[PDB]
Design a protein around this nucleic acid. Structure first.
Ligand SMILES: Nc1ncnc2c1ncn2[C@@H]1O[C@H](COP(=O)(O)OP(=O)(O)O)[C@@H](O)[C@H]1O
Ligand SMILES: [Ca+2]
Ligand SMILES: [Zn+2]
Length: 613
DNA sequence: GCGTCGAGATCC
DNA sequence: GGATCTCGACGCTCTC
């Protein structure tokens, strides 16, 4: 499995390794990086599957530096292009972009530079619409191609009027290699991407999509106190760190933001109800940690944000699909540092999302109900490892269920925290009871749970009243939720006089199958320091961060593009002002110590006494 | 008009 | 600390 691509004896190895160490300041290759770098430098077409934060950028940026000529990178978002170019400029790697969001005089200047004997530009980032609308671009690529200075085509996020366009590039310039990258976890989509690009004999580099540093939690939601719960959890676990709070509605964003602001927390709301410039202002404040620590957002927020130091993502209400949850929680810890993914769950939010699906135009309504049901299952599954649940959902099996046990510092709540019964007789009695009391039904799920348990609060004291005497309230609630998810029972939403969605229970499509036929129902029962030096290291880190923020203002660059969180962390841990020591740190380079070194070394020299333990 | 949530009051 | 009942507010919808 790519054994030939594991060699460090190729004619290219020496210049490649020197660029790895001297330009990038790196020391060790991550999974499949060396293999993909070697394959690309040999002129092989590559297909790379890595999760977010895996290190996909190096796979084309290191070869781009080694190769003579220009590596053309096709990317869909202007913001992701701007951020990549900032990283490369910071490292003194000649890079630029053409997105339309460039002056006509400035774009013409990029074409002028590209047509020179030595184009100098190693990486050119383009938007997919430039492949079709820019004759000036294609004529420039034609010129580079005739001169053997078109090194590679990169499709940074491979994900209609995009794929036929990338195929146009291959037909126009067939001898230039192609590298395609994707972070999509969906195994059928990974196959569709690979077959659709139709690349000749591709080298395919894939790996586990398990984000080792993401700690997944699901907590019961107290709807009237969720904002105070988020607030307390933030001040206890991440008072000085950036985060996102995902909320179901625009009003809930404004409420969440207002509550946090009243406690002195720098929080801002982000939803489509805001103007485009107001949204842009919120996003920039949040990325730069400048007047915004917490973004309280609807699904309107996300696409095109690569902030590497998000320490928490809180879902104040569950999302509408597992894919959405995976993408939203996935915004956390892109730098590999421990980050938290916390979801506040209540079944009441499920029927709030069910009324959102009932407001749409259609089979597509049944699809969204199914996707939602898959998300409710993840919430209700308080037994299986949260990592294994998400991975199994995206066709990744064989994964170690002992991961959260082997690495307890990044454990999910299910691994930190079981029987079985043939309840078919009980469900047959529930089904015959809701048949007789079938807005389309007479009772809600809560009413049904009271009756079943034989509660004094029950609205009827006959039929199934007390039938569930052997179940606890928690198990009776779980039993009824299971029947709705299993389509044995169904819910009809009724809008009351206060615009509240009320779910009345009726028979589902599988009710006649449980009684008439024999659909056996199985239910499973459940029950629910410090050091003087370490403190100085912590103090030095805050100072080092402030340095990057002031340098960021003067260079017109995001602070994390000066030095990332891992580099900053390691720099603070060293407490050294000696370059010989600083150059062994990942991301520390001669070019960066020249640019930023004076400001960085002046902070480190103040901790001179604590350098040696 | 009425379902739902959560605080307050019971007994364990 | 639960478990269980009763009373009294308060109730509201996501993306190009
Ligand atoms: N071999 C490596 N050693 C150390 N850091 C690395 C290495 N490869 C990548 N990184 C860093 O890991 C982080 C995530 O990489 P990135 O290219 O942005 O990931 P992706 O595109 O897969 O989401 C970046 O900060 C990057 O500089
Ligand atoms: Ca990327
Ligand atoms: Zn686990």
């Amino acid at each position: 499995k790519h054994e030939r691509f594991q060699s460090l004896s190729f004619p290219h190895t020496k210049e490649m390794m020197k660029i790895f160490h001297k330009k990038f300041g790196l020391h060790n290759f991550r999974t499949n990086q060396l293999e993909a770098i070697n394959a690309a430098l040999l002129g092989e077409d590559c297909f790379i599957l890595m999760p977010t934060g895996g290190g996909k950028s190096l796979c084309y940026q290191l070869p781009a530096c080694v190769s003579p000529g220009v590596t053309v990178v096709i990317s869909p978002l202007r913001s992701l292009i701007v951020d990549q170019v900032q990283k490369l400029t910071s490292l003194d790697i000649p890079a630029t972009y053409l997105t339309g969001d460039k002056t006509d005089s400035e774009a013409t200047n990029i074409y002028l530079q590209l047509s020179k004997k030595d184009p100098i530009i190693k990486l050119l980032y383009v938007t997919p619409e430039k492949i079709c609308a820019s004759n000036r671009l294609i004529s420039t690529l034609e010129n580079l191609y005739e001169r053997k200075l078109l090194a590679r085509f990169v499709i940074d996020e491979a994900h209609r009027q995009d794929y036929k366009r990338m195929n146009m590039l291959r037909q126009k310039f067939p001898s230039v290699p192609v590298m395609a990258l994707t972070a999509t976890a969906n195994p059928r989509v990974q196959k569709d991407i690979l077959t659709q690009l139709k690349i000749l004999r591709p080298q395919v580099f894939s790996m586990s999509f398990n984000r080792h540093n993401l700690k997944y939690y699901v907590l019961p939601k107290k709807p009237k106190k969720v904002a105070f719960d988020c607030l307390e959890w933030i001040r206890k676990h991440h008072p000085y760190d950036s985060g996102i709070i995902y909320c179901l509605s625009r009003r809930e964003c404004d409420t969440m933001a207002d509550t946090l602001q009243r406690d002195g927390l720098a929080a801002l709301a982000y939803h489509a109800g805001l103007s485009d410039s107001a949204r842009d202002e919120v996003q920039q404040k949040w990325i730069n940690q400048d007047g915004c620590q917490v973004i309280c957002a609807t699904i309107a927020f996300g696409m095109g944000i690569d902030k590497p130091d998000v320490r928490f993502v809180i879902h104040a209400s569950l999302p509408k699909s597992v894919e959405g949850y995976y993408q939203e929680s996935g915004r956390a810890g892109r730098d590999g540092e421990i980050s938290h993914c916390l979801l506040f769950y209540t079944y009441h939010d499920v029927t709030r999302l069910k009324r959102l699906i009932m407001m749409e135009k259609d089979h597509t309504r049944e699809t969204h109900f199914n996707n939602l049901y898959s998300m409710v299952h993840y919430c209700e599954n308080i037994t299986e490892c949260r990592r294994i649940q998400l991975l199994a959902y995206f066709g990744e099996n064989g994964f170690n269920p002992d991961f959260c046990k082997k690495h307890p510092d990044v454990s999910c709540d299910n691994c930190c925290k079981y029987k079985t019964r043939d309840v078919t007789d009980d469900v047959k009695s529930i089904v015959r009871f809701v048949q007789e009391h079938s807005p389309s039904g007479r009772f809600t799920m809560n009413m049904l749970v009271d009756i079943f348990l034989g509660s004094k609060s029950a609205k009827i004291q006959s039929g199934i009243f007390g039938k569930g005497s052997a179940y606890s309230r928690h198990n009776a609630e779980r039993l009824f939720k299971k029947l709705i998810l299993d389509k044995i029972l169904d819910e009809d939403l009724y809008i009351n006089a206060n615009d509240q969605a009320i779910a009345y229970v009726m028979l589902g499509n599988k009710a006649q199958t449980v009684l008439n036929g024999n659909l056996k129902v199985d239910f499973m029962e459940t029950e629910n320091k410090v050091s003087q030096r370490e403190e100085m290291v912590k103090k030095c880190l805050g100072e080092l961060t402030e340095v990057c923020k002031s340098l960021g203002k003067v260079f017109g660059v995001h602070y994390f593009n000066i030095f990332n969180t891992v580099t900053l962390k390691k720099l603070a841990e060293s407490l050294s002002s000696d370059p010989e020591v600083l150059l062994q740190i990942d991301g520390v380079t001669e070019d960066k110590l020249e640019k930023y070194g004076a400001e960085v070394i002046s902070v480190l020299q103040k901790y001179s006494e604590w350098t040696s333990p």
